[PDB]
Amino acid sequence: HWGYGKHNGPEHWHKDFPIAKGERQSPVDIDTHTAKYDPSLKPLSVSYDQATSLRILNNGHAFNVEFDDSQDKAVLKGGPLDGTYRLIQFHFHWGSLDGQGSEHTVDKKKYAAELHLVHWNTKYGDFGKAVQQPDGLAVLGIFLKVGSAKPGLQKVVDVLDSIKTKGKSADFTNFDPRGLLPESLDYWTYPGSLTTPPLLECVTWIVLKEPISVSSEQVLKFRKLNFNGEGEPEELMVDNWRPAQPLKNRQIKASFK
Numbered sequence: 419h420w421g422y423g424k425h426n427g428p429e430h431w432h433k434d435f436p437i438a439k440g441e442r443q444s445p446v447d448i449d450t451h452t453a454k455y456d457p458s459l460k461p462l463s464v465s466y467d468q469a470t471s472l473r474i475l476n477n478g479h480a481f482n483v484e485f486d487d488s489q490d491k492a493v494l495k496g497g498p499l500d501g502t503y504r505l506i507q508f509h510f511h512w513g514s515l516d517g518q519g520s521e522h523t524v525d526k527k528k529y530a531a532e533l534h535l536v537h538w539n540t541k542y543g544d545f546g547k548a549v550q551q552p553d554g555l556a557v558l559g560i561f562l563k564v565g566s567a568k569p570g571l572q573k574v575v576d577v578l579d580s581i582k583t584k585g586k587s588a589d590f591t592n593f594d595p596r597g598l599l600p601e602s603l604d605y606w607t608y609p610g611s612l613t614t615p616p617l618l619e620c621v622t623w624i625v626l627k628e629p630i631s632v633s634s635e636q637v638l639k640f641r642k643l644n645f646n647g648e649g650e651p652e653e654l655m656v657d658n659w660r661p662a663q664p665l666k667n668r669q670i671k672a673s674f675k
């Protein structure tokens with residue numbers, strides 16, 4: 419099965435997922451000097467006041483915080499998007515060391531981690547249909563640097579002990595994803611893909627310019643999670659990031675000067 423090890427990591431994925439070498443793969447390096455300011459891009463509309471978190475799951479590659487996406491409760495609109503995208507889950511990618519862990523890079527700079535808030539286009543009715551469309555998903559990406567603690571992350575950090583191993587889940591109600599956002603919603607946007615198999619080319623990527631700060635202790639707790647199932651040999655869940663992929667025939671647009 420695919421993963422992040424020497425034998426099943428990102429350089430292997432193309433053998434089961436040939437779209438790995440496709441024309442719109444993610445993540446990418448964001449060259450801040452070559453990104454073009456698009457004054458036609460709208461402010462992002464992040465409407466998370468009615469968000470309903472349900473559960474947190476260790477899926478063997480990350481943990482997902484899942485949301486009730488059966489009504490317009492937590493939606494992303496505006497920016498480069500046409501129509502209404504519902505929040506279904508967020509998860510993170512992180513490193514074994516503070517100098518690596520993000521999937522996107524900014525002028526080749528790696529951040530300690532990256533948050534992905536995953537949303538699907540309501541005109542396609544469900545997430546399974548949306549991932550089959552070139553405009554099916556909108557993923558809001560937010561960089562994490564190590565510094566001050568992020569208070570709004572701590573409820574996530576404190577439950578991870580209960581989902582240490584693959585297939586473990588825990589109730590995770592009344593979590594407010596607004597506490598994970600930076601002050602600025604300035605962004606870069608480009609068309610891309612899922613960053614894990616099946617690597618579908620269904621994502622409008624929206625990557626915030628402003629990172630959030632998390633403490634060394636918060637990201638240390640991410641690194642105590644396991645890729646393996648209970649009773650299987652312990653392999654720390656670290657370095658669950660795909661490296662930057664070729665930009666090919668794509669332009670990254672900036673919402674800001």
Ligand SMILES: NS(=O)(=O)c1ccc(C(=O)N2CCCN(Cc3ccccc3)CC2)cc1
Pocket residue numbers: 534536545546549557611612613614615616617
């Ligand atoms: N890193 S990320 O780019 O933000 C990101 C990567 C993967 C997902 C994701 O949802 N998965 C797990 C589920 C399977 N689906 C596809 C599917 C194929 C057949 C029936 C149903 C769904 C896509 C991969 C989401 C976001």
Ligand SMILES: [Zn+2]
Pocket residue numbers: 509510511534613
């Ligand atoms: Zn992701």
